[PDB]
């Protein structure tokens, strides 16, 4: 299960945050700052995997805004990257040419998509079209 997910920009600003572990607000802020510093202080050939606090911190940013995850040392490392890619593809399909501008203004939509996709740090829907259809149906309810 993913302990937490933090979508941070290249400048260090965070556009999304979803932690599945109940942590203090100050402790959560410190952890986010440390993760941003580690990711921002890492090269492009670091393997996209960092063992921070015994957590397989996987970073894979496809644009200026980066992505982070906190996977426990009990599952495969490529699974987190595949899940991140699937989530990015689903968000792009739901939004349509998703960019950094739409992420800040449409943070509620991204949060709803993440909630409908991954709940409690585990995967909720393996397919990419069923989740999109469910999100569209929920949005169309009003």
């Amino acid at each position: 299960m993913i302990h937490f997910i933090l979508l941070f920009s290249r400048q260090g600003k965070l556009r999304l945050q979803k932690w599945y572990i109940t942590l203090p607000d100050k402790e959560r802020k410190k952890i986010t700052r440390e993760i941003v510093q580690i990711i921002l202080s890492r090269g492009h050939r670091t393997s996209s995997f960092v063992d921070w606090k015994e957590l397989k911190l996987v970073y894979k940013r496809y644009a200026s805004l980066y992505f982070c995850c906190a996977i426990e040392n009990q599952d495969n490392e490529l699974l987190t990257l595949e899940i991140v890619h699937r989530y990015v593809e689903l968000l792009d399909k739901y939004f349509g040419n998703v960019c950094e501008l739409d992420i800040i203004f449409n943070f509620e939509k991204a949060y709803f998509i993440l909630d409908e996709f991954i709940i409690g740090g585990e995967i909720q829907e393996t397919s990419k079209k069923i989740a999109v259809k469910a999100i569209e149906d929920s949005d169309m309810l009003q």
């Binding site: 920009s9 200026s64 968000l91 792009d92 040419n97 998703v98 960019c99 950094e100 501008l101």
Partner: peptide, 10 residues
């Protein structure tokens, strides 16, 4: 800018 670019460009 660098923000208007698509995350995956699909």
């Amino acid at each position: 800018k660098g923000e208007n670019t698509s995350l995956l460009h699909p």
